[PDB]
A paper describes a structure:
Gloeobacter violaceus proton-gated ion channel (GLIC), a prokaryotic model of pLGICs, is particularly well-suited to stabilize preactive states under suboptimal activating conditions modulated by pH. The GLIC homomer consists of five subunits, each with an ECD and TMD. GLIC is activated by the protonation of a series of titratable residues in the ECD, leading to counterclockwise rotation and contraction of the ECD. Therefore, we established a data processing strategy involving symmetry expansion, backtracking particles, supervised particle reorientation, and 3D reconstruction to resolve high-resolution maps of various asymmetric intermediate states of nanodisc-reconstituted GLIC at pH 4.0, which provide comprehensive understanding of activation mechanism of GLIC.
Residue numbers in the entry:
A (entry chain A), B (entry chain B), C (entry chain C), D (entry chain E), E (entry chain D): 5 to 316
Write the structure that this text describes.
């Protein structure tokens, strides 16, 4: 069929709305995430009678091949959405109700700085196709936009899901300048990360730090170097549960600082043994007593400085 | 071919039924699982008879393009099901028997607390589109629902497969539609996990604990640190089996407690050596004799408390 | 078109034959594999015949849509096969020759309880739809059953490919159906497993057993714990290819026994050192001399018992 | 629906242009990258010239069918592009307007002689085969060639996206064809590779070097060999990413040099101990004092020479 | 439509030809690779011929569904090729041209008997069925077989791409078929393997060999066991990318020999210590002095013998 003819020079406003259901498969290396959700639309279609009569006040059912369906394309999807219509219901005289379920691989930026304690925003951009009838503009209705409060997004909690009309700036053609933006606010749950990552590494570092209460060079060497090996193994373990991020990160800075501390500890042990052999035991004892207090305080101050630098 | 016309405004009850064939590929990171099964509806027609002659008592077999096949849609599937019709034989009495086969990827939430001893319940939802003549009521046929007793899911044993009628309760009550829920209770076989994971860790921990019968500081340091390295390697080895779970788990708590015990053992060894060097062998011996009984009892009590907290 | 007339009171026999072309991608975790083969059919239809008067060629071609073709459905397949009809020929007496070429992926159980030295059997099931007029039965033609010489599975050698000519009839959903069974026996090529897996483990164990010829406590501790670390590392190489079976296996039993032996060796070393420190060297010497012979004999007997248990 | 007739012998020209949207999934081992963009075309056909003087005022508009759209294909793609048409329009004189959106995966070789600090160039080739009755040649419309401001690649900086105006015509398969070239120049962001890789290995090497201030043989052996093990683990972690090339890169040369330095350090330690045992301590002291200064200077000189060779 | 008339004495002969565009993704464990190429056909049809008079100068250009096109299939492919027709032309005498571009995945065995320095041959098989009226055979058009200059494989270099002109005619399921063989010979780029695998192994072995110049039991144990631990990781790395074979390769034999050497070294160290403790130092000195020369010579001879056995 064909879209309705113009009635009174009033543009055909399409009241769009996304009813999110599922979010999963957040592949971070390619920065893609699949979405399973509904899509509700309503375009006022007066002057095209669809059984308007009091005796026929019943709700009429229409199929996909019954009325003109506006064509809306997602901008940032790898392929066209695989959409199946759930139902189409039209009032005897008034608007039209539409609902369909689709799946699509969406591409949105995913910042990973301050990774354990970060928030993310997901964007879906919508555009409409103008046809032989009057010009079509896009508007959002707040009655249909929302979730079912049973979203199966694990590891994150949804804070808001809103929309706003924004201009479209890409290959402008005096048209198609009424794109839509949908923002999904999510926040990572950071509780399990503490016992899973942070505490064991601190335990390993504190085990390495016990060499300042000993004077046995072999024992100190074994302690520090085997603790470094254990740290490398734990870094291998951690690296798996984390996407490949070719940029600086809070966790990477912490790891680098840990490596630096290991190097400084090795230097201190070597200096102490060298002085003891060269027969300056008072100087060696002074150095080790100073180190016992110096190391944790410097570690804590560096942690505070780095946290302030990264988290405003 | 159209849906049957109404007779006396009696709603038509469709006796649905799902017969499982294959269940496989229970992926937990994506929180999905593919299923291959049957589908049967027992809707009957009254006005539109199908050769109801006594002489032609032979069962009439029809192609899909011979009658009206109801459109049933699954709420929580990624894509539309592949409808592979099996057989459509309609008796001249009036009732219709239908069979088909589909292979759809189902989305269902999973819980991985008490991971080695966990049980899961998988859900399948159904919906039917109302027609403009009258309303279609969804019902459950008890005989049709069942399995073939050769459904093979690796690592799980299937217990029951039942169906109930529940209200839709969706925020988009287009037609006050109904819904169906199919539940598949399963359990995990946990016996192999004991020899595969639990016992080697206990052996490694006891090997670590053998340092309380020795006085050689270098030997004790080597034992404890190499045992810690072995524990880290075993954790890397066993990380490949657990799903990537963004919340706390019984096994994770056990591993964290093991790390804490290693740290405490290192501290105890350091204290013993420091006392011996400071020439307090009585205190050193008292502490090292106390530890031999202190460590296993505290470990057992912590295990009991953790088990009670996680399993009620 | 309509099925052949039921004037022939005897059941309509449909000869069947599957000729393999290649087999590939034998999956272990999902226990599925993909196939590519011909599908032959043959039956007699007196409704359409040929005469030499029309032509002396004695062979008549046809189109799939102009001839009643029985419908054959696979049972244990993830999706529908991709059928490619080749040619249809009609004998002058009414014998029809049908041919196709398909590809599909088959679901079949696997049993890795003798993993290095196990054998498997892959099944393909065929069913035929009943018809109102006549009765349909399935038969097996041995001359149409075979396999190419270029069929190969990476790591397996094919023994035989036969078909059970005995259908297992059953009544499902008030309908009678017939089934066929095609069996493909395979065996795993285990020769490479010996020098790649078994012998290095024996070498490492024999290296660790050398601690019974020395009295230096530190050297014994280093030997035993470092060999334990090496065993843990080698287990990763072993598990990088072994399928994740959630049940008991011969290899898992061997590995668990190895862990137990390591624990017992650590215990023996600790006991010897403790006895030597308390100025009782004769008992320590007796213990180590006894262990030197005790360990290999017990290991051999346990290996024999396990081999008898899992292969008897 | 048919090639336009030439006046006497003139060929036909089509003006193209690609507007990027986003680039992602740039593989290093596979040497492939994905893309999705807009494709614009324009060509002149005087057979369907519009006449606004008498027959209508508005210019012609069409649909994806019932109009000839020339065959435009990509040479270096794995599969045919997935495209959907967005707009078609026809000018009164005869020139046509076309637009579509596509997504494809492109094959292009990469050069890793300067892997941490390298820049690449990606090629996209278009082509069209001349039909019998009318040769076709391509052209570039600079007003349409460009990239979106949101075009971002993870870890790369985009510098330019231009097209070579001159086509490369050649006779292939007894037909004349024309080819366009699109070039995308990018540069890697190298900062994050410094603290993640470069510095930890230097720290480990210095920890290894620290053994020249010691005279205990066991401590030196422990230091050097454990640092070698740590280097091996780090090298495996690094090599998990970079692919293998027929030529020699920079990182591989650095790693090989580090291995050589470790071997020489082990040799020096063994020589020092052997000389000390034979009661010649002065030579051992001279050798170790020489090595203390010899090693870092040679390391620095070799690094400078490698930097000059690879980047000069 | 219809097969060409068998008025000509010879059977129907089709001239084929494949022109490679690019090859990629040569999987090693699955023994597969992907291809993108053209496909040209040519045969003789007595009908459809036309006279250059009556506008017959224009050579006819039909489309599929208007002529009889022979069915040609690839034997060793996982799925049917994704093909699109390019152009069909008919010469006035009666010969028919044909062109088509496709992409497919090919199955072909490999031979890793000389894995680092091996050469492979890849096969693509074309087959054709037979029709009732006439018989069909294949041929090779020499001037239509070739490859682009941009055909590159990652890790290999392409030598030649020819075709065996002699078909293999045989009867398969009561019909005669003809087959063609296309061979692609490639050689491996082995330069990257030497400085990444071979030399570090030799360095580690030489480092472990330094225990023959020492007399301290603990240092020797540490050296040998830590070198074995380092060797195991390289074994894992090498075995990751090399599949399992029923025969014995070169690298596996080298690795097994290295394991044997490590075991013998451990035995020698233990024997030396046992003799030294027993107050027999001269015999131990003789043993270690003999071993110093014995080990490298035996290693060199064994390497030479293995190289002669596998490559000669
Ligand atoms: C030194 C620091 C030791 C105390 C640190 C405790 C921090 C919390 C922690 O790691 O807990 C892990 C774990 C239990 O976690 P739950 O709180 O039961 O998790 C379920 C509820 N979310 O702690 C233990 O098992 C403690 C063992 C003693
Ligand atoms: C954070 C940095 C942690 C570094 C590692 C801690 C090492 C502690 C060793 C202290 C030690 O040996 O002291 C022995 C000392 C000697 O006794 P006198 O008072 O002289 O009689 O005895 C003690 O202090 C008894 C032990 C008390 C507990 C020691 C550890 C407590 C802190 C643990 C870390 C918490 C985080
Ligand atoms: C010497 C005796 C060795 C007996 C070994 C028996 C054996 O291997 O049985 C394994 C068997 C099941 O077979 P798998 O295939 O491993 O099943 C799980 C999948 N991996 O597992 C078990 O036995 C389960 C564990 C229960 C028994 C545990 C025995 C513990 C013994 C402790 C001895 C301590 C010695 C102290 C000396 C003082
Ligand atoms: C569980 C925790 C296990 C930690 C390790 C326990 C074994 C330490 C070694 C004990 C030791 O040296 O005892 C020597 C002691 C000396 O006897 P006198 O009184 O001097 O005569 O002899 C013995 O105890 C004999 C050997 C028995 C050791 C086996 C004990 C069982 C250990 C594993 C239990 C199962 C888990
Ligand atoms: C140790 C100190 C920290 C490591 C050195 C920091 C390197 C950053 C230097 C800037 C590199 C980029 C740049 O603009 O330099 C120019 C140039 C690249 O530009 P094109 O020639 O176009 O390519 O870069 C170079 O030549 C840099 C190469 C030498 C310096 C980097 C070497 C660092 C690692 C080697 C030493 C340690 C061994 C491990
Ligand atoms: C790049 C560097 C690569 C090599 C690094 C090896 C480690 C540095 C040397 C550690 C031991 C130095 C040492 O023993 O010096 C002690 C020596 C003793 O004093 P005298 O009275 O002269 O005797 O000097 C000191 O105490 C000075 C302090 C030494 C540490 C400062 C140097 C740190 C180097 C970082 C690089
Ligand atoms: C490659 C084959 C296997 C190599 C194993 C590693 C080689 C170890 C060599 C150690 C040499 C050693 O300890 O002896 C040093 C010995 C010192 O003894 P002198 O008193 O000078 O004369 C001997 C009579 N008293 O001689 C030397 O200093 C020679 C220098 C050793 C260079 C070794 C180079 C090895 C290169 C391998 C490639
Ligand atoms: C098969 C089971 C293998 C069990 C594990 C074996 C552990 C290693 C064997 C012991 C090595 C040390 C032997 C030793 O020190 O022998 C001393 C002994 C001293 O002799 P007398 O002074 O007369 O007494 O030295 C010798 O001459 C013994 C010869 C030993 C070398 C040959 C060893 C062969 C081992 C084969 C292991 C199985 C394959
Ligand atoms: C000293 C300790 C060992 C260090 C060196 C270990 C590695 C040695 C490997 C030698 C090697 O690969 O030689 C193989 C190589 C090839 O053998 P073919 O099979 O005949 O060649 C193929 C063409 N027909 O053999 C030779 O070239 C032998 C020539 C003498 C080698 C050096 C002897 C001195
Ligand atoms: Cl879309
Ligand atoms: Cl569905
Ligand atoms: Cl099927
Ligand atoms: Cl294309
Ligand atoms: Cl094909």
């Amino acid at each position: 069929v064909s879209p309705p003819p113009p009635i009174a020079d009033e543009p055909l406003t399409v009241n769009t709305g996304i009813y999110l259901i599922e979010c999963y498969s957040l592949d971070d290396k390619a920065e893609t995430f699949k979405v399973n959700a509904f899509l509700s639309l309503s375009w006022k279609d007066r002057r095209l009678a669809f059984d308007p009569v009091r005796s026929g006040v019943r709700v009429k059912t229409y199929e996909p091949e019954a009325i003109w369906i506006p064509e809306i394309r997602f901008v940032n999807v790898e392929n066209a959405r695989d959409a199946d219509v759930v139902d189409i219901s039209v009032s005897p005289d008034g608007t039209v109700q539409y609902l369909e379920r689709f799946s699509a691989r969406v591409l949105s930026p995913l910042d990973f700085r301050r990774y354990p304690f970060d928030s993310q925003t997901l964007h879906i951009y919508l555009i409409v196709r103008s046809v032989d009838t009057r010009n079509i503009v896009l508007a959002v209705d707040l009655e249909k936009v929302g979730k079912n409060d049973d979203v199966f997004l694990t590891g994150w909690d949804i804070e808001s899901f809103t929309a706003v009309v924004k201009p479209a700036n890409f290959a402008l053609e005096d048209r198609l300048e009424s794109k839509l933006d949908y923002q999904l606010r999510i926040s990572r749950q950071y509780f399990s990360y503490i016992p899973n990552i942070i505490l064991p590494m601190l335990f390993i570092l504190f085990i390495s730090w016990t060499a300042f209460w000993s004077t046995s060079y072999e024992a100190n060497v074994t302690l520090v170097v085997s603790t470094l090996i254990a740290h490398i193994a734990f870094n291998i373990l951690v690296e798996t549960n984390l996407p490949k991020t070719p940029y600086m990160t809070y966790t990477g800075a912490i790891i680098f600082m840990i490596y630096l501390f290991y190097f400084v500890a090795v230097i201190e042990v070597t200096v102490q043994h060298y002085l003891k052999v060269e027969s300056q035991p008072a100087r060696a004892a002074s150095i080790t007593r100073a180190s016992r207090i110096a190391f944790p305080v410097v570690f804590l101050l560096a942690n505070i400085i780095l946290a302030f630098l990264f988290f405003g």
